[PDB]
Amino acid sequence: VLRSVNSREPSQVIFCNRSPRVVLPVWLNFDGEPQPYPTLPPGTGRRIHSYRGHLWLFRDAGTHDGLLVNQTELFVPSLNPIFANITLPVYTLKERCLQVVRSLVKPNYRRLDIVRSLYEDLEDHPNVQKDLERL
Amino acid sequence: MYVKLISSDGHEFIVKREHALTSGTIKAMLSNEVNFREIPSHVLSKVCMYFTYKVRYTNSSTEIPEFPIAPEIALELLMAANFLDC
Amino acid sequence: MDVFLMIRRHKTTIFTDAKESSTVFELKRIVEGILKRPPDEQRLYKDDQLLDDGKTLGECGFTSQTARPQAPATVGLAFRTFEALCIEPFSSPPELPDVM
Numbered sequence A: 001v002l003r004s005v006n007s008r009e010p011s012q013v014i015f016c017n018r019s020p021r022v023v024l025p026v027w028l029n030f031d032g033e034p035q036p037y038p039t040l041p042p043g044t045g046r047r048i049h050s051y052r053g054h055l056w057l058f059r060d061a062g063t064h065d066g067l068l069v070n071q072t073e074l075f076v077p078s079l080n081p082i083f084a085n086i087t088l089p090v091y092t093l094k095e096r097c098l099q100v101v102r103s104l105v106k107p108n109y110r111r112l113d114i115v116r117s118l119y120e121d122l123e124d125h126p127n128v129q130k131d132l133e134r135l
Numbered sequence B: 001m002y003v004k005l006i007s008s009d010g011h012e013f014i015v016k017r018e019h020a021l022t023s024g025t026i027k028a029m030l031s032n033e034v035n036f037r038e039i040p041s042h043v044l045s046k047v048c049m050y051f052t053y054k055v056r057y058t059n060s061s062t063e064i065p066e067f068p069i070a071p072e073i074a075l076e077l078l079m080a081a082n083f084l085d086c
Numbered sequence C: 001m002d003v004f005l006m007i008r009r010h011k012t013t014i015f016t017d018a019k020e021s022s023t024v025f026e027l028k029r030i031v032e033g034i035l036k037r038p039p040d041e042q043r044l045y046k047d048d049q050l051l052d053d054g055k056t057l058g059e060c061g062f063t064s065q066t067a068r069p070q071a072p073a074t075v076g077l078a079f080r081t082f083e084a085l086c087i088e089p090f091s092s093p094p095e096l097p098d099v100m
């Protein structure tokens, strides 16, 4: 369902990483499969050649945390270049805590002293395929 | 209008009421003081900092900065955030 | 421009914001509405330095990029003779677990 439209109409895009994370751009091909592209260091930009009707989402390249592009999840290049403003979302305090704890404990998760439902929250890593079924 | 969120060690944090209504749990414990038997001050102060952070950068176009969490408080803040659902 | 502050005295901690152009006395008016104490019985501090009623928060070093929402600046409070400036520290976090 979530797939790019094979319109063959070029659309110039600027991937603008206004976030402290290493951004991993993800193109959804014509069969819905997520395709990864070269990453963007924090504060860096890149001019890419895409097409109208194509689907792009952006994540943390290291942790796959969700990121916003133009204050939304999905970015679709339109008629011309279009700016793709990649920013941090306002994470919930819980998810933000899971992010910090995940970055310090190796998936030794059970060895922590927390409730059992918090272990399953730590193991439920952010994942592009999980979010695709959600959308 | 303000409310008082009291930590487990007696520290009293006075924040705006609409900031405290962010957490659905705190709205229930108010319906105006609230005592937290399990949240020490070095965790609740961070929670109040998130209230200001969330209200300021939600529905905002300017670039959003990262909410900092020291490693030594990450585990406790996680349990508090899981309980308060914030 | 908004500055985000923690007004702290003893074991009290007020989270509020104010304009960079707003004055120290106007901050005491904010404290008055919350803790029910008039400004004449109030003393405001930056660290250890006593703040003057007529000076703005920006002149007192409370700038937008130092008094952030996720990291607010601290304003010391003292009540009235006047007590000494007393701010109880927050609790100490535990030692880092071995897996961290």
Ligand SMILES: CCOC(=O)c1cc(=O)oc2cc(O)ccc12
Pocket (backbone or CB within 6 Å): A113, B038, B039, B040, B043, B076, B077, B079, B080, B083
């Ligand atoms: C292991 C010691 O840490 C805690 O027990 C704890 C700390 C905290 O800040 O908030 C909590 C909230 C809860 O609902 C349950 C427990 C906690």
